[PDB]
Amino acid sequence: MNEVKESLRSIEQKYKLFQQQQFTFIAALEHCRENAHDKIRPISSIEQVQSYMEHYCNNSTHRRILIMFMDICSELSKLCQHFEALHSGTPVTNSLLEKCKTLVSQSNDLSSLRAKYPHEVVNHLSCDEARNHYGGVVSLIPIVLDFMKEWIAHSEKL
Amino acid sequence: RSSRLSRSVLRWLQGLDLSFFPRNVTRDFSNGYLVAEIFCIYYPWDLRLSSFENGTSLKVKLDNWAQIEKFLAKKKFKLPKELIHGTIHCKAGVPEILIQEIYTLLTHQEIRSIQDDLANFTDYIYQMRLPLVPRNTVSKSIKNNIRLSELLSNPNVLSNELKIEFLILLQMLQRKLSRKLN
Amino acid sequence: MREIVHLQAGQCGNQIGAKFWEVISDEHGIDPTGTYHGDSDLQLERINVYYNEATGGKYVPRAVLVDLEPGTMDSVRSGPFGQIFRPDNFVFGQSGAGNNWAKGHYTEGAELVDSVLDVVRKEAESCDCLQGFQLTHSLGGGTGSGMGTLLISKIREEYPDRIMNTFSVVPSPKVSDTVVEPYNATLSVHQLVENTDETYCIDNEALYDICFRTLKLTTPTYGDLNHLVSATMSGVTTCLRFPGQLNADLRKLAVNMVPFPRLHFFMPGFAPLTSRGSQQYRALTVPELTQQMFDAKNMMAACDPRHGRYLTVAAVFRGRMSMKEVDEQMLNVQNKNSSYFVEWIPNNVKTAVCDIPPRGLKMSATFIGNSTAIQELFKRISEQFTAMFRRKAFLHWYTGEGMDEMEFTEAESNMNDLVSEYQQYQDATAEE
Amino acid sequence: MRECISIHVGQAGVQIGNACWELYCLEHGIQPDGQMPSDKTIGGGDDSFNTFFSETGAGKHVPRAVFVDLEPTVVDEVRTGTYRQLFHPEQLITGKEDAANNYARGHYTIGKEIVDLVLDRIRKLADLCTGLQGFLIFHSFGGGTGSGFASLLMERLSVDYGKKSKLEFAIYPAPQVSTAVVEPYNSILTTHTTLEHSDCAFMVDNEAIYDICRRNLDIERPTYTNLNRLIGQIVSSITASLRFDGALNVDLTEFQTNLVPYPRIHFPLATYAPVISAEKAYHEQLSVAEITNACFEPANQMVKCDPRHGKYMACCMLYRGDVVPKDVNAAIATIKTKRTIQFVDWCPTGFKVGINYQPPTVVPGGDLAKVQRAVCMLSNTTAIAEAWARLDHKFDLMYAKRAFVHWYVGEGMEEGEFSEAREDLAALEKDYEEVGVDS
Amino acid sequence: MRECISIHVGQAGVQIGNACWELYCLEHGIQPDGQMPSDKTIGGGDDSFNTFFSETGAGKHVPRAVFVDLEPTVVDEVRTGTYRQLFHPEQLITGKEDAANNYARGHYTIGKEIVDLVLDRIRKLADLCTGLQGFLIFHSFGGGTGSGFASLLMERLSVDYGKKSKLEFAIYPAPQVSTAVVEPYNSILTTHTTLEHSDCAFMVDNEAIYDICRRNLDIERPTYTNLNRLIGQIVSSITASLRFDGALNVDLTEFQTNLVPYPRIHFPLATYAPVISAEKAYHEQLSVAEITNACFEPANQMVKCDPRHGKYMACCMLYRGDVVPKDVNAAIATIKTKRTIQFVDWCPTGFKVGINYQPPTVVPGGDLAKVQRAVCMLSNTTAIAEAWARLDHKFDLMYAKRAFVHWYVGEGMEEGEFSEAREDLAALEKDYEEVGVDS
């Protein structure tokens, strides 16, 4: 049981590191979009992200932050699959697990996914970026972490 | 009954209509409220008694006395700064002398003063005149000549230690002399 | 309205004040939290005398604790009611007393007294009108005795139109606590007779003997004495706290109780001092209370009033009994016991009954008298001070602080004058 | 608040300080590691430990004491001990050369070399503290280190702090038994410094310890550990109201103010009670009256002197444990009427009442048993003046022909200092005689 | 309508402006995004926010303030904060070089370079507003950025707008403690400019803040955040009747007109009350008389000066929260008969009654508790002239030997200005004592 908690605290730590470098992350995203001639469609899918990191990337720190983010997504996926391997639980746990495995999809729409209080990932950027440039890429991990916390809280009272 | 103030000085001190008679000359005048009242009595258009508070605080004494020397500098009156400092820390024998000079400055009447300049600050002569040779310890002399008040006022370890060792040398020489007298 | 501001001094003063506060809180229905859990009627109207009105009806105490040692505040705050007082009032220094009056008045009474003056002035201004100030302390140390006189002098000089009552603890040659105790007592007596309205005599040895020979306690301690003095204080103050039929106040007593300002000492006392096994076997009546209130066994004095003559007497009752029995009892006492009070002044007893009974006990009454008995204590104090002064022992400590020795000379001259005055008023003859 | 700094000079001072610190750590549940590893079963320790120890940000305790010695052997002996992880090495200063029962070398040619270091150390220790009342200087008259270095340091300390109390605890050489020969040589010089430059001084000997242990504890082969334990018990009893509280707290200033009737007469007589073993504490009812009466017995006195020869001027009593005031009152009533006890026609009474709620504790492996209460007495009488008389007689008989003085001459010192010390001691004895004489 | 523009110069000015803006948004419920996202549970916001904010066509709020600083580090520090989405980047002008406690560079070689930009910015901001009454210039005397640039800007604002009120808010260099050394050098030049070209000036310090917080708030570890919170509370209390209304509205003009007795004497004494923590606001009954009496206590004064040294000429009193007129009248009747408070023999009375129905609010994470009512007083007295006296003494003892003057000489400026400032300050003082002298 403790292994999932250690994994979750590591996820939270790398998350905290990510927003500490969220500014550089957005700068790298803008550089990639300028180098890929795609400055119209907001980035709302992981697949676009690894497509940019693997094709339109020249700076080593940019690919470093992108591979750290991809590792973030992979760790979220591994925690989700460990949770699904643990047990079924109540239907609300099943729904939480399903929505989380959906949110960690490589090809999923994130254009209508935004974070709220107390998550300040939106407030760190301009409103325009959060609406139609980068709104789901930044407002994905905190919300998934909240669902993980809720799912663990529900499983613990079983 | 050893109020060191002269009969004439006391006869003029009573003659000023002070709010309260000083029962303890050393302590009451340490604040400076009484002397401020005296100066207001003599010079009403230059000092305001309302500006002075009758309290026992070191800070209040400092401020009252501060207004006092500001006034004195305005009036160009010559009074020793060491005398004022001793009065503030209510040193033995100092306030009586100070009141004597205040009387002489105001009334312009010369007094057959027993002692004008700095006197025997410590009680060495008094102790020698007493039988049963006292030979007070270093701590006793420190407490007699060094009080908590001036330590709070101005701290300087170097000068304090210089004065301490000077007084210790004086004590040792006087002890040698006393042993010679034996 | 008419409120009373309370003052604290001395570790024994602090403990007895805390005990009194706990006793009154219990009697008037105050929880240790700070709310009100009473079920009476008169415990809401005149409750603001010792409390102050606040939001949520959370009354706060009105007392300033003065001390030189931080080691008393922690002891009293840790009690069941130590979390209810005002921490701002706990004004304590950094250096201890060491049972010296002179230096505590000089060293620890210069830079610390400003805060207590400020807070008491703030408290006095906070109320509309006041009657006086109560300060409980002891003469056994430089904490109570060193600063109680100074603060009383300050408040008298500031507000002369107030009541200065105090309950200091007189020493005892048999039961001592300080080597230099007579010096401090002599120094305190001067200010007590010069700058104090009234003063009551408190002895620990007498309370000791009383509890042993009457209460028959297994292991009596200071807590019992604090309880007794608290009960005495409440019985004294119930005349204003709980109105009845014949109410009185501190000033009327002090005026009617004191023939001359130079002699303002009194003799307190409580009547029902019984053992545990005797509580269920007692007849509650007038003559029993009168007998316990007149005899020498129940007073709290380390002396004998039968050696002199009664000067002034006040009998404050607290219950629902009568008026006729008290006056007839005092009449027949003055008739029979004629060689015990001043014949020159008839009717030396004052009647006072509080219709409001105390909490927990149905019958209560206190004794406030001024009999000719403190003369022995005064003369023995004078003798022992003359002794410890002739060859000047334990004097270098006082000398090193700065103060001279003529203060002792004037104090002993005043004390000799006072004892001569007392002894020549003792034989108050009618004529030549 | 009530915090003090202890000074330990010489081998005796170091061992006494170690005993005091171990007694404090065992009585306060302070583990030798320096932290509180007691996470399973607690056994106390929730008290005011800031008087002697210090609290770190990591939950650690740092002793506040000075462990200095001219000879490094004692420092090495303590350093290889089991409590080496408690203190800090910076507080244990070693030395190349040592006095070893001499005053001249350790006062001029040895002690004067290490001055700035110890001054800086003690200044830092004082800065680490908020409230300072007095000091605990531990040394000995026999040890040349604890005499010369002690005197030279305490002179600077008293000139540097005139408002701080200066205590003294050392060993007085017994007239009957002794360890070395040059003991009075150093004693005559150290007494002048301790008299004309300090406020109070405590004299103790080892012969009385041996007598009391053989009479009560009934041991045929004593050891220094029992002596140090007795000294530590006395010290803890004296400073009992500082670490803890009680009905009537008695601070260092509180009893030191009355314990000194004259600046020249500040030499009290300490007496601990009950000094008993395990078997002497089971079938013996203990009250306050008996032990207070036994406190005045010469057999229980710490110094070999008959009280009946002189009389008392000032008396200071202390208590530790579950005591009831009525018993103290009864004891006072009993002793004030005893004709055997002599006193001046001048002080009808004088004493204190120190009530401490915390009972004295015990040590696993010691000889002291579990006692519900304790009592310590500090009296002032002129009957003890004979010890100085014997010391002066010995100094005179060994000074007429100048025995072992050429060494001091060669080291460099004034020969007239011997005469100065002799005349000062003679004047002190004359003053003690005058005070002991009534009208 | 009642709309004002705030000016923030230097790090202290910018941080004070940030504290004021965050206080305004929390008290009015303005969300950090700048919109009204509270669509589920409303928590307020239906008021006249036009005084400080501006309403767009899309439901957006734009702050109306000037955040200028010569050093870009403060601009970056604010820009990386959580409120970067609130203001606009064009209002935060960075800089290549900064004064940093220097007047000559920031007044001639540094400040003169950025003039047209800030003038265009303030002109646009004024054009965006309808009614203008006064300005809120926040700077400092120690900071060179807040002194030279502030002086050069206000000199031009004075000649460009004569019909508009010109306020002043900055920090006074305490004589006991200080941050830098050249503080008097910049202060002596800044006082002349603030005197001969402004209408009012507010002088505050930090030492008294430390004293009052340690005395009431009882914090062993203060921080600049509490200082900024106190200053922002003072500012909000002053401009309370502008954002809201009440029984007697007191506008900026309403109090500044009477707050200025003479063109040379425009230095009021600010004192906020109550200044207490959470535990200091629970078991303490709060009425108007007690706090009004406490407002005259020197311990609660922002400037360390004994009011008893001088006397009052003009006084401006304000209130905020549920206050009853009878309590105000009783307090006035009490203080008018108080002998301790001194006043001139020509002004028997003078004061204002500002009733505000809206009580002051609290902040999540701050120290201020929930108080039903507040009070602020602005009095004029001669007892504060000692600060100018001490400053003149320090400048004189610094200028005799020309310490650190060669730098200003090399930068390019007239040396006679120091004499000009000294004589102007001497004349201003002399006027102050002449006014303080009654008949």
Cα three-residue angle D293-D297-D299, rounded to 5 degrees = 140
Residue C173 · residue C380 · CB < 8 Å: yes
Q: Which two tokens stand for residue D265?
A: 């007469």
CB of E130 within 8 Å of any CB in chain A? Answer: no
Resolution in units of Å: 7.7
Q: Which of E32, E80, E85 sits opposite A126 (nearest CB)?
A: E85
b/e per residue D51-89 (b: at least 16 CB within 10 A) = bbbeeeeeeebbbbbbbbbbbeebbeebeeeebeebbee
E86 vs A contacts (CB less than 8 Å): none
Contact B63 E306 (CB under 8 A): yes
Strand partners, C269: C367
Residue C280 DSSP class: T
CB of C173 within 8 Å of any CB in chain D? Answer: yes
Q: Which two tokens stand for residue C117?
A: 């003056």
Contacts across the B-C interface (CB distance below 8 Å): 26
Contact A120 E84 (CB under 8 A): no
CB of E308 within 8 Å of any CB in chain B? Answer: yes
Residue E376 DSSP class: E
Chains E and D touch (3+ CB pairs under 8 A): no
Residue C79 · residue C21 · CB < 8 Å: no
Rounded-to-integer distance, Cα C261 and Cα C254, Å: 10
DSSP codes, B4-50: -S-HHHHHHHGGG--SS--SSHHHHTTSSHHHHHHHHHH-TTT--GG
CB of E298 within 8 Å of any CB in chain A? Answer: no
* Residues making up chain A, counted from first to last: 158
A23 vs E contacts (CB less than 8 Å): 80
Partners for D (CB, 8 Å, 3+ pairs)? Answer: B, C
Strand partners, C346: none
Q: Minimal Cα–Cα distance from A112 to chain E, Å?
A: 16
Rounded-to-integer distance, Cα C339 and Cα C57, Å: 55
Q: What are phi and psi of C61, to 5 degrees?
A: -70, 160
Q: Which of D254, D133, B53, B27 is nearest to C110 (CA)?
A: B27
Q: Minimal Cα–Cα distance from C98 to chain D, Å?
A: 4
Cα-only R_g, chain A: 16
Q: Which two tokens stand for residue E422?
A: 């000294």
E342 vs B contacts (CB less than 8 Å): 50-51
Residues 92-131 of chain A whose Cβ lies under 8 A from any Cβ of chain E: 120, 123-127
Task: Cite the beta strand spans of C275-423 per DSSP E.
Answer: 310-318, 349-354, 364-371
Residue to mutate among D156, D163, D195, D437, with most B CBs inside 10 A, is: D163
- Judge whether D254 counts as a catalytic residue: yes
Rounded-to-integer distance, Cα D5 and Cα D167, Å: 11
Q: How far is CA D428 from CA D184, D388, E256, in A?
A: 17, 9, 80
The SS3 call for residue E165 is strand
Contact C400 B144 (CB under 8 A): yes
The SS3 call for residue C363 is coil
Rounded-to-integer distance, Cα E193 and Cα E151, Å: 6
Determine how many CB atoms are found less than 10 A away from the CB of residue A124: 18
Identify the residue whose tokens are 């005893």.
D338
CB of D58 within 8 Å of any CB in chain B? Answer: no
**Is omega for the bond preceding D298 within 30 degrees of 0, making it cis?**
no
Contact C125 E293 (CB under 8 A): yes
E85 vs A contacts (CB less than 8 Å): 123, 125-127
Identify the residue whose tokens are 């109105």.
C243
Name the catalytic one among D90, D97, D254, D420: D254
Give Cα C177 distance to the centre of its chain.
19
Residue to mutate among C94, C106, C108, C392, with most B CBs inside 10 A, is: C106
Identify the residue whose tokens are 């001190």.
B13
3-state secondary structure chain D: CCEEEEEEEHHHHHHHHHHHHHHHHHHCCCCCCCCCCCCCCCCCCCCCCCCCCCECCCCCECCCEEEECCCHHHHHHHHCCCCCCCCCHHHEECCCCCCCCCCHHHHHHCHHHCCHHHHHHHHHHHHCCCCEEEEEEECCCCCCHHHHHHHHHHHHHHHHCCCCEECCEEECCCCCCCCCCCHHHHHHHHHHHHHHCCCCCEEECCHHHHHHHHHHHCCCCCCHHHHHHHHHHHHHHHCHHHHCCCCECCCHHHHHHHHCCCCCCCCCEEEEECCCCCHHHCCCCCCHHHHHHHHCCHHHCCCCCCHHHCCEEEEEEEEEECCCHHHHHHHHHHHCCCCCCCECCCCCCCCCCCECCCCCCCCCCCCCCCCCEEEEEEEEEHHHHHHHHHHHHHHHHHHCCCCCCHHHHHHCCCCHHHHHHHHHHHHHHHHHHHHHCCC
Q: How far is CA A108 from CA A22, A44, A99, A100, A148, in A?
A: 21, 8, 11, 11, 19
Q: What are phi and psi of C134, to 5 degrees?
A: -105, 125
Q: Minimal Cα–Cα distance from D272 to chain C, Å?
A: 21
Contact E283 C60 (CB under 8 A): yes
Residue E263 · residue E305 · CB < 8 Å: no
Residue to mutate among B123, B136, B138, with most D CBs inside 10 A, is: B138
Partners for A (CB, 8 Å, 3+ pairs)? Answer: E
Rounded-to-integer distance, Cα D4 and Cα E109, Å: 60
Q: How far is CA D280 from CA A128, B156, C339, D235, D274, in A?
A: 90, 58, 61, 23, 10
Helix (H) or strand (E) holding E270: strand E269-273
Residue D292 among known ligand-binding residues: no
A118 vs E contacts (CB less than 8 Å): none
Q: Minimal Cα–Cα distance from E160 to chain B, Å?
A: 45
Strand partners, D319: D375
CB of A20 within 8 Å of any CB in chain E? Answer: no
Rounded-to-integer distance, Cα B148 and Cα B58, Å: 11
Contact D346 C74 (CB under 8 A): no
Residue E71 among known ligand-binding residues: yes
Identify the residue whose tokens are 């109020």.
B3
Rounded-to-integer distance, Cα D49 and Cα C352, Å: 54
Helix (H) or strand (E) holding E282: none
Identify the residue whose tokens are 């258009």.
B45
Give Cα C379 distance to the centre of its chain.
22
DSSP codes, B79-112: --HHHHHHHHTT-TTHHHHHHHHHHHHHH-----
DSSP codes, E37-66: ---SS-----S-GGGTS-B-TTS-B---EE
Q: Which of C34, C60, C126 sits opposite E290 (nearest CB)?
A: C126
Rounded-to-integer distance, Cα E383 and Cα D8, Å: 57
- Domains identified in chain C and CATH numbers: 3-257 (3.40.50.1440), 265-374 (3.30.1330.20), 375-425 (1.10.287.600)
CB of B51 within 8 Å of any CB in chain E? Answer: yes
Residue A37 DSSP class: T
CB of B161 within 8 Å of any CB in chain D? Answer: yes
Residue C152 · residue C191 · CB < 8 Å: yes
Residue D71 among known ligand-binding residues: yes
Residue C204 among known ligand-binding residues: yes
Residue C111 among known ligand-binding residues: no
Q: Which of D251, D262, D350 sits opposite C179 (nearest CB)?
A: D350
Determine how many CB atoms are found less than 10 A away from the CB of residue D316: 24
Rounded-to-integer distance, Cα E175 and Cα E181, Å: 11
Q: Which of C11, C100, C175 sits opposite D329 (nearest CB)?
A: C175
The SS3 call for residue E21 is helix
Helix runs in E29-162, H state only: 72-79, 103-104, 116-127, 150-160
Q: Which two tokens stand for residue C186?
A: 């002599």
Contact D348 C100 (CB under 8 A): no
β-sheet with C130-136: strand ranges across: C63-66, C3-9, C130-136, C163-166, C198-200, C265-270, C364-371, C310-318, C349-354
Strand partners, C8: C65, C136
Q: Minimal Cα–Cα distance from B163 to chain D, Å?
A: 11
Q: Which of C402, C396, C95, C394 is nearest to B147 (CA)?
A: C402
Residue B87 · residue B94 · CB < 8 Å: yes
Give the orientation angle of helix A141-156 with respect to helix A2-20, to 10 degrees: 160
Which residues, 6+ apart, have CB-to-CB distance to D110 below 8 Å? D70, D95, D97, D98, D99, D148, D149
Residue E231 · residue E376 · CB < 8 Å: no
Rounded-to-integer distance, Cα E41 and Cα E38, Å: 6
Q: Which of D261, D324, D329 sits opposite C394 (nearest CB)?
A: D261
Identify the residue whose tokens are 């027949």.
C332
Contact B56 C402 (CB under 8 A): no
Q: Which two tokens stand for residue E36?
A: 């009204």
CB of B50 within 8 Å of any CB in chain E? Answer: yes
CB of E33 within 8 Å of any CB in chain A? Answer: yes
Q: Which of E48, E63, E436 is nearest to E249 (CA)?
A: E48
Rounded-to-integer distance, Cα E283 and Cα E279, Å: 8
Q: Which of D197, D264, D434 sits opposite B138 (nearest CB)?
A: D197
CB of E336 within 8 Å of any CB in chain B? Answer: no
DSSP β-ladder status, C198-200 and D132-138: unpaired
Residue to mutate among D257, D355, D357, D439, with most C CBs inside 10 A, is: D257
Q: Minimal Cα–Cα distance from C387 to chain D, Å?
A: 7
CB of D287 within 8 Å of any CB in chain C? Answer: no
State the burial class of residue A8 (Cβ atoms within 10 Å of its Cβ: 0-12, 13-18, 19+): middle
Residue B164 DSSP class: H
Partners for B (CB, 8 Å, 3+ pairs)? Answer: C, D, E
Q: Which two tokens stand for residue B169?
A: 């040398």
